[PDB]
Scaffold this active site. Structure first.
Site, PDB file in Angstrom:
ATOM      1  N   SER A 130      -0.076 -39.720  -5.620  1.00 28.44           N
ATOM      2  CA  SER A 130      -1.147 -40.506  -4.967  1.00 28.44           C
ATOM      3  C   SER A 130      -1.857 -41.326  -6.051  1.00 28.44           C
ATOM      4  O   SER A 130      -1.193 -42.183  -6.651  1.00 28.44           O
ATOM      5  CB  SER A 130      -1.981 -39.526  -4.123  1.00 28.44           C
ATOM      6  OG  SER A 130      -2.901 -40.244  -3.342  1.00 28.44           O
ATOM      7  N   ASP A 176       2.883 -40.718   5.944  1.00 31.34           N
ATOM      8  CA  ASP A 176       1.663 -40.693   5.126  1.00 31.34           C
ATOM      9  C   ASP A 176       0.539 -41.500   5.752  1.00 31.34           C
ATOM     10  O   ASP A 176       0.696 -42.705   6.006  1.00 31.34           O
ATOM     11  CB  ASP A 176       2.029 -41.254   3.739  1.00 31.34           C
ATOM     12  CG  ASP A 176       1.043 -40.858   2.676  1.00 31.34           C
ATOM     13  OD1 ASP A 176      -0.163 -40.761   2.979  1.00 31.34           O
ATOM     14  OD2 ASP A 176       1.443 -40.671   1.505  1.00 31.34           O
ATOM     15  N   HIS A 208       1.506 -36.921   3.376  1.00 31.55           N
ATOM     16  CA  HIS A 208       0.997 -37.184   2.027  1.00 31.55           C
ATOM     17  C   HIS A 208       1.054 -35.951   1.152  1.00 31.55           C
ATOM     18  O   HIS A 208       1.132 -36.073  -0.075  1.00 31.55           O
ATOM     19  CB  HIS A 208      -0.444 -37.663   2.117  1.00 31.55           C
ATOM     20  CG  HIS A 208      -0.996 -38.158   0.812  1.00 31.55           C
ATOM     21  ND1 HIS A 208      -0.530 -39.317   0.225  1.00 31.55           N
ATOM     22  CD2 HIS A 208      -1.954 -37.671  -0.015  1.00 31.55           C
ATOM     23  CE1 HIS A 208      -1.195 -39.537  -0.896  1.00 31.55           C
ATOM     24  NE2 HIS A 208      -2.068 -38.558  -1.063  1.00 31.55           N
TER      25      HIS A 208
END
Lengths: 258, 258
Positions: A130, A176, A208
């Site tokens: 991320s 996601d 995610h």
């Protein structure tokens, strides 16, 4: 002929293994010992008889710590890499800062008494989850000698990565909702140079959070990418080119052959 | 004497432990075998000599798999609970559905061959992350016999929980921008009955994803809450009343003394 090849000829089985052919050990870098990052854990092969290894640094995302990416450390290191999972200087650091800290962690390895003589500092790579994956892209964009970059569900406000010169594997998670592939991962793949060795691999039905617990698909293609590009190991090209016949992948694009 | 007390008197260390005093085993419920949910893993104490245990079901959030909340399964079960971590029927199920699936998972334990003789079917609880935490609230709102509910960074479009009769611990994350505590966690705490046994604990500096990776604060106070209310174990009141002093907690409110 390739002096950087390590370990036996690979198979699907060998790149899927929770632990590869190299036994591993670990050592800790405290926050106090770390210049330019928040400390970390270094995982390394205990076998010194095959030569030195390439190095990989891995960053977590916003407010997160090493534990959110820790499983990747020994899983990749046991394939023949020195791998440091980092904490950041503060919990709030943004992607470009996380990229500088990944580079600082890699450069720390050449000063660490436990592993400095086990690494080839000319063969290094960056990964992260991320915001940490946005950091991996920033690290590559700020060091064209890095051998590989792997953003995992990467998040960044910067969408244009046309200055990257480092082979990049962009791993998206199909579902996601935090770093949606349409506005993050796929946008990054599209702006990386058209002639760069690169791939987009989308994990089918994945959230995610897929990189924060063991995921065999993430591991196997991350390992193949690091082998192909940190070690220039052509034995691993077969796993990367063309799209794998893998149900766990919902979408694939690449500049194969490499 | 309280017949539901299990294990030795607790300490801060004992509720922070990655594994408690009960050895655990596991059994899998496949998606095909699961009626009304997507399958799951049941973690349970192998020692039956202190009596049967309360049961807990745990749901992941939107788009996510069982693996994203799996760490809670054996960590809680080893304190003396039968815990099922579930997958949902689809990855896109909304909170109310997640609640019905949590209830279906609890009901499945009543006839599951491995654990039917290990559970007290009258003592059950629900937990979950984000939409799964909204699911825990929904399950409690549709079953006032549940003994405890624990939404972790919960998300729900419904903000008023005045008909819940189940002691609820609301675990918010200070820096959550996905289920912000002001409009989700704190709203839920405020609308639960004023005379319910309830608490709100905010995790300092934490993002929406904090409880998806092992987090000592999440674990220790979830364990204390489940002990206090699934087992009516007054030995665990000390950790809840008054506010814990942990630096990891940025805000606390409760209806102590219970």
């Amino acid at each position: 002929a390739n002096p950087y090849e390590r370990g036996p000829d690979p198979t699907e089985s060998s790149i899927e293994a929770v632990r590869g052919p190299f036994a591993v050990a670990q050592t800790t870098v405290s926050r106090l010992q770390a210049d330019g990052f928040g400390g970390g854990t270094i995982y390394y092969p205990t076998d010194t008889s095959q030569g030195t290894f390439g190095a990989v640094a891995i960053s977590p995302g916003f407010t997160a710590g090493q534990e959110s990416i820790a499983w990747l450390g020994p899983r990749i290191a046991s394939q023949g890499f020195v791998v440091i999972t980092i904490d950041t200087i503060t919990r709030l650091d943004q992607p470009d800062s996380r990229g500088r800290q990944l580079q600082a962690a890699l450069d720390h390895l050449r000063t660490n008494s436990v592993v400095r003589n086990r690494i080839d500092p000319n063969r290094m790579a960056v990964m992260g989850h991320s915001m940490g994956g946005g950091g991996a892209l920033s690290a590559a964009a700020n060091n064209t000698s890095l051998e590989a970059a792997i953003p995992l569900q990467g998040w960044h406000t910067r969408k244009n990565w046309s200055s990257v010169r480092t082979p990049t594997l962009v791993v998206g998670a199909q579902l996601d909702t935090i770093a949606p592939v349409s506005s993050h991962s796929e946008a990054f793949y599209n702006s990386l140079p058209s002639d760069l060795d690169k791939a987009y691999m989308e994990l089918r039905g994945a959230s995610h959070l897929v990189s924060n617990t063991p995921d065999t698909t993430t591991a196997k293609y991350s390992i193949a990418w690091l082998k192909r590009f940190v070690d220039d190991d052509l034995r691993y090209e077969q796993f990367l080119c063309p799209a794998p016949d893998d149900f766990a992948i919902s979408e694939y694009r690449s500049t194969c052959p490499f």
